[PDB]
Amino acid sequence: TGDIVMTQSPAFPPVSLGDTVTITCQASQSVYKNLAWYQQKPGKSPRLLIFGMSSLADGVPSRFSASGSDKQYSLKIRGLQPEDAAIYYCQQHYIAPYTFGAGTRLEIKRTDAAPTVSIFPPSSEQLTSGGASVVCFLNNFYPKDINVKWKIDGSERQNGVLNSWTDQDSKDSTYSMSSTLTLTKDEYERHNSYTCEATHKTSTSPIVKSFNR
Amino acid sequence: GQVQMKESGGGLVQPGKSLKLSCAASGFTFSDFWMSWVRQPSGKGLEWVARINTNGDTTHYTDDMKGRFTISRDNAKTTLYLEMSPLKSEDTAMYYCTRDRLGPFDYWGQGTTVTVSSATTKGPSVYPLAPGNSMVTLGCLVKGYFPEPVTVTWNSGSLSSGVHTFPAVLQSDLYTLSSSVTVPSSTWPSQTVTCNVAHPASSTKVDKKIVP
Amino acid sequence: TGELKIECPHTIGLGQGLVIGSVELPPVPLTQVESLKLESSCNFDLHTSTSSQQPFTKWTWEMKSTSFQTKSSEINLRGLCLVPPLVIETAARTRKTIACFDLSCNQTACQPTVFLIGPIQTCITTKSCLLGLGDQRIQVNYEKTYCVSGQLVEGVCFNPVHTMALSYDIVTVMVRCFLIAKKVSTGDSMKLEKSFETLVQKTSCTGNGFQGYYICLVGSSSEPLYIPTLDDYRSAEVLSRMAFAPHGEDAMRIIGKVTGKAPSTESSDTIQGVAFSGNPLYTSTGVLTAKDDPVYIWAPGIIMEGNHSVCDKKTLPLTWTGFIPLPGEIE
Amino acid sequence: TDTAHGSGIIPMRTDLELDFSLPSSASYTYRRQLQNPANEQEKIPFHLQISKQVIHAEIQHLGHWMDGTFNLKTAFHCYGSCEKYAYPWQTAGCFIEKDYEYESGWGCNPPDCPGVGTGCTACGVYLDKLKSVGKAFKIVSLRYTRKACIQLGTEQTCKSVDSNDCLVTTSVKVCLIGTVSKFQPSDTLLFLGPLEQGGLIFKQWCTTTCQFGDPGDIMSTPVGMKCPELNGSFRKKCAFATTPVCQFDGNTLSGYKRMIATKDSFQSFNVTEPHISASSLEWIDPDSSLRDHINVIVGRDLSFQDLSETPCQVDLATTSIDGAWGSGVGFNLVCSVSLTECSTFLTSIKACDSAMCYGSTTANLLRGQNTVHIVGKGGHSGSKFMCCHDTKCSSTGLVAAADSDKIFDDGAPECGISCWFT
Ligand SMILES: *[C@@H]1O[C@H](CO)[C@@H](O[C@@H]2O[C@H](CO)[C@@H](O[C@@H]3O[C@H](CO)[C@@H](O)[C@H](O[C@H]4O[C@H](CO)[C@@H](O)[C@H](O)[C@@H]4O)[C@@H]3O)[C@H](O)[C@H]2NC(C)=O)[C@H](O)[C@H]1NC(C)=O
Ligand SMILES: *[C@@H]1O[C@H](CO)[C@@H](O[C@@H]2O[C@H](CO)[C@@H](O)[C@H](O)[C@H]2NC(C)=O)[C@H](O)[C@H]1NC(C)=O
Ligand SMILES: *[C@@H]1O[C@H](CO)[C@@H](O)[C@H](O)[C@H]1NC(C)=O
């Protein structure tokens, strides 16, 4: 294909809150002024930020600005806030086809927070299905690098576990994680104690939360 | 006054069947703008699909879908349509109807999910999570549903603060996710906290009261 | 000698238009204000209404040691712009000329603003003539317009839209309005302050009973415009500009809040405002909105309360000068 | 009675490629006769008609530009605070207030109020006489289109060629590739009066930080009023035993006043045949300040046999004349062109004499009689002007006694010096 390529550099290091940031968008061909910037919050729909390479879209705060030279453009943000921590795209519309970019995600740098751990036993409604699932929540921590581990009567268990992570919060810039150990009733009735451990850089000592049957 | 656009008509289709998507727009003169469809895969970049002019005599498509997609509009009802030929597994994405300004797109809708797979719809299961102080937390587990998405709210949605909906995980044709809420210890179990789960495909609507 | 300029159109046209001009004169001491009489040497038919005696409550402030002493009394003024109903509206037909003044005053001095309104035929009969007010002479100059179809507005020749239906260029023009007292027996059709309250209020005011209306002339010449005319876009525009600039549109030093009794025979306060010193800026005349029967006020050195969002102790000004945008064609 | 006023004959040994740079307000007329390299007497007509440039600009309605007058007032109070009382400037359309709360000393105090640190001095800058002076639009995207018609032998094809489209046939291809434009996105077009009067172009139209005096300071947006701040600072001028007055050493003239003062320093533009909607603004630029790059190519596999059966016959006759043969007066010729054996045929008629051709007129003839007007300038005293097709002309002509934004290119060999001053 002989289309224009919009090189958008991902993997931007975290920046502190309230400072000034600048994202770049390189082009394989000069489009001269036909560039638009977009913002896609995690889970929500995209949002037009800047059109015409220098014109702010309606409903965009005054702390946004854009400029650029030939085939080398930038998007500057002054006075960072916890809300505008999302993925940004650049689109050229000079010649067909009107192509998009790769995407650059920001990350607000806050103070280290301890995770709020919690464990939940399987419910009586789930026991009717024949299987059991122990849930362990880890909400409102920073940074995102965290590790989880399950213990069954003191023995390590690292199979049949399904866990997921959330993106950075738009209100307090914290992360969260939910782990679920799935087993059957035949195996759940064999053991008594179940433990959910977590290791984070906020404390070298791992936090422990368990429950008996 | 305000601009509002909503998509509809998506869901799950077999690999080789047709599907027509609709999009209702309001708050602006629908018969003065160019309309366009833009889809985005799960965790990938945006991809322009089609574009239509004011009346409907000029329609632009992509070189991939040669005659497979057909964009149309109805100015009398201010609606946008996108008829699709027998689809393939590479069309599974979320489609947005946008207001094309001959180039940039200045307004995007909510977006509907289109899944092209040979699997069958499955009904979810909602399980409450009882504690087992200072700031108590509760959970709501939605296990074994297909396909995406689901809607999880707390007390008709008036608990947006302190809520945490977690991304689902796919386990061999069966999704499952969980939601976490945090309320003060003086409210629970002093007040009835209710978890609301909705699944469009299976027509599931479950409201569970969390009790110890 | 002051200068009162009248811009004359090329034709009379549809018959019912009036010319208007006005000039603000230099300050005169307060003691001289009660003696002021308009004299005319002009070849036109003066309406006699405005030169009769007209009862006003005079409301004044003095420093004391909140820090103010106010007082009031009933006096008779003459020559002020208290125009009876129908006089302006039918002046094109009666061939009557209205000449009157309003007063813009601080504690010690007043600047009269002289208004001259009359039939467009005066432009045929008259190039210049003289008015006198106390010791000041006023040169009225009738001057033929640079334009072919409209009026010179902001250095541009402009003709406004004429059709009664809905359909252009936009030009900002002067509007001058005179408060007319006019009662009806039954209902609320003449409750002028209620019209202001609907436009700018949250909640219900109990007692704003003044009955009357404004009669306005647009630019240097127009047919009279009645305020409020409910379905007229110009009436709506004038009312909105009145609501946001209740003392008109165009150093004065603000001292503080004052209250007083109008009429002076009231046992409690019926009016409020803001005392000031320095150069008079706004007119110092109005009517209480609270009384059906007009209570006219002259308040030198006080900006009487005209904020329509307030319920009590407020007023409407006797004259009002501002600007509204008109749709039309520049040529 | 025919005369050698034919078009440029081009042998089709190789492909015929052409590049064009059409001005903005210009219509081109390129016509030749493609010759079969295997037969000198086999020629087919080739006509290329390109219209003017249609500029389509998706715009953003900025609203109305307002003009006001600067005013400053001062309010003094002896006791209390500045945030306790109201002021007449707070209820205006646009107002900026700076107050010296609790800053009552004694050198700035009046004869009254023998107090210190208890008064209030408020200063209000407001704008009155707000009237609209023009309408402003902001360019979001641009699009240029031209309507092109081709006529090859007996086939006729027309299309509106865009930047992402080309008129492609079995033998001819017309593409629109580039466009040099005076306008570009993020520009602000301001129309003081109506549309046809033209407007001005502003690049630094203030959007976020507007000040009194900048282009776009006071705007009448459909949502409401958008008032700017001031370019200056406040100060308290006071004397002994006098009320403290308030001064403002800043900009007093409004944005419209400064724009009128230095109007010559801005870019101007004209429009013709305007069409504005809630989303677009279409017009034709008459200033000829835009150039479109068009590429035309005709293959040499024309199949002269298929384009030769039943060609388009054209007969004509001069029927009227009006004007003079002087260089500057001009004359108008009327021709009765009769087209046969073809439903529609695109060609052009010329008003020629024994030597030259002083005018032309392109018309899409229908099957039957067609009245064609031709304007011309020039000629001599004994010039008998006639209507002429490629080669055949009318039987008789007429004689007289005592630019248009069209471009004609038929490749005809013009007369040399023998036709100059005769
Ligand atoms: C009500 O408003 C009126 C009118 O605005 C106002 O009265 C005027 O005040 C000014 C200044 O306060 C007076 O000006 C004087 O004019 C004479 C004429 O020859 C001058 O000679 C005077 O000059 C001396 O005073 C100045 C003081 O600063 C000096 O700078 C100067 O060099 C001279 O020494 C003087 O300026 C004017 O005469 C009166 N006008 C009338 C009509 O009386 C009045 O103050 C306002 N009232 C209140 C209570 O605020
Ligand atoms: C006109 O009168 C109203 C009512 O007295 C004033 O409105 C108040 O203004 C203050 C400060 O702006 C607000 O804190 C209040 O909430 C307002 N009250 C209401 C009921 O609206 C208004 O400011 C006055 N306008 C002036 C003095 O220009
Ligand atoms: C617009 O037209 C006028 C007509 O006289 C001309 O003088 C002016 O130069 C034109 N504008 C431009 C930008 O050429």
DSSP state of A202: T
Number of C-alpha atoms within 13 angstroms, CB side, residue D281? 23
The answer to whether the beta carbons of residues A20 and A76 sit under 8 Å apart is yes
- Sequence-distant (≥ 6) Cβ neighbours of residue A11 within 8 angstroms: none
CA distance A179 to A166: 12
Coil vs helix vs strand at D265: helix
The CATH code of the domain that includes A62 is 2.60.40.10
End position of a domain, from candidates A109, A135, A151: A109
The ligand with the least distance to the CA atom of C310 is 2
- Asked if B1 reaches chain A (Cβ–Cβ under 8 Å), the answer is no
Q: Does the residue A94 lie in any domain?
A: yes
Q: Does the residue A68 lie in any domain?
A: yes
Q: CA torsion angle for D405, D408, D409, D414 (degrees, to 10)?
A: -120
- Which residue numbers of D have CB closer than 8 Å to B's CBs? 56, 58, 140-143, 164, 277-280
Per the DSSP assignment, residues forming a β-bridge with C102 are C113
Enclosing H/E stretch for A213? none
Q: Does the residue A24 lie in any domain?
A: yes
What domains are there in chain D, each with its CATH number?
9-58+140-182+286-298 (2.60.98), 313-419 (2.60.40)
The answer to whether the beta carbons of residues C83 and C178 sit under 8 Å apart is yes
End position of a domain, from candidates A85, A109, A133: A109
Q: Does the residue A1 lie in any domain?
A: no
CA distance B155 to B138: 13
Quote helix, strand, coil % in chain D, to nearest 5. 5, 50, 45
**A13 and A93: one domain?**
yes
Asked if D112 lies within 8 A of C330 by C-beta distance, the reply is no
Among the partner-chain residues D164, D185, D207, the one whose CB lies closest to the CB of A56 is D207
Name the residue among D203, D216, D60 with its Cα closest to residue D141.
D60
Amino acid making up residue C200: V
CA distance C105 to C112: 8
Tokens of D90: 């707070």
End position of a domain, from candidates A109, A131, A151: A109
- What ranges do the domains of chain C cover? 1-331
Distance from CA of A36 to the nearest CA of B (A): 6
**A90 and A123: one domain?**
no
Amino acid making up residue D233: S
Q: Does the residue A187 lie in any domain?
A: yes
- Sequence-distant (≥ 6) Cβ neighbours of residue A205 within 8 angstroms: none
- Asked if D86 reaches chain C (Cβ–Cβ under 8 Å), the answer is yes
**A142 and A203: one domain?**
yes
**A104 and A10: one domain?**
yes
CA distance C127 to C144: 9
**A93 and A133: one domain?**
no
Using a CB-CB cut-off of 8 Å, the residues of chain B touching D143 are: 102
Coil vs helix vs strand at C41: coil
Name the residue among C48, C105, C44, C118 with its Cα closest to residue C79.
C48
**A94 and A154: one domain?**
no
Asked if D278 lies within 8 A of B29 by C-beta distance, the reply is yes
Asked if A52 lies within 8 A of D207 by C-beta distance, the reply is no
Q: How many CB atoms lie within 10 A of CB B175?
A: 20
Query: What resolution in angstroms, rounded to 1 decimal?
Result: 13.4
- Asked if A33 reaches chain D (Cβ–Cβ under 8 Å), the answer is yes
For chain A, report the end-to-end CA distance as a whole number of angstroms.
Answer: 63
Q: Among the atoms of ligand 1, which is closest to the Cα of residue D243?
A: 50
Q: How many residues does chain D have?
A: 422
- Asked if B67 reaches chain A (Cβ–Cβ under 8 Å), the answer is no
Experimental method: cryo-EM
The ligand with the least distance to the CA atom of D268 is 3
Asked if A164 lies within 8 A of B177 by C-beta distance, the reply is yes
Domain that holds residue A104: 6-109
The answer to whether the beta carbons of residues D32 and D46 sit under 8 Å apart is yes
DSSP D209-234: S-BTTSTTSSEE-SS-EE--B-SEEE
Q: Does the residue A190 lie in any domain?
A: yes
DSSP D354-394: SS-EEEEEEEEEEEEEEEEEEEE----TT--BEEE-SSBB-
- Sequence-distant (≥ 6) Cβ neighbours of residue D24 within 8 angstroms: D52, D53, D284, D285, D286, D287, D288, D289, D290, D291
Tokens of B99: 């207001």
Name the residue among C250, C255, C251 with its Cα closest to residue C278.
C251
Enclosing H/E stretch for B141? strand B135-145
Tokens of A63: 């702390």
Name the residue among C29, C31, C33, C26 with its Cα closest to residue C109.
C29
Name the residue among C32, C102, C60 with its Cα closest to residue C277.
C60
DSSP state of C93: H
Rounded to the nearest angstrom, the distance between the alpha carbon of C295 and the centre of ligand 2 is 26
**A206 and A127: one domain?**
yes
- Which residue numbers of A have CB closer than 8 Å to B's CBs? 34, 36, 38, 45-48, 51, 57, 89, 91, 93, 97-103, 116, 118-123, 125-126, 129, 133, 135, 137, 139, 162-166, 176, 178, 180, 211
Helices (H), C116-232: 122-125, 192-200
CA distance A161 to A76: 42
Count of structural domains within chain A:
2
What domains are there in chain B, each with its CATH number?
4-116 (2.60.40.10), 125-209 (2.60.40.10)
C-alpha dihedral sign at C45, C48, C49, C55: positive
CA distance D115 to D78: 8
Pairing of strands C128-133, C38-40: antiparallel
User: Greatest CA span in chain C, whole angstroms?
Assistant: 63
**A14 and A94: one domain?**
yes
**A61 and A135: one domain?**
no
Bond before A61 cis per omega within 30 degrees: no
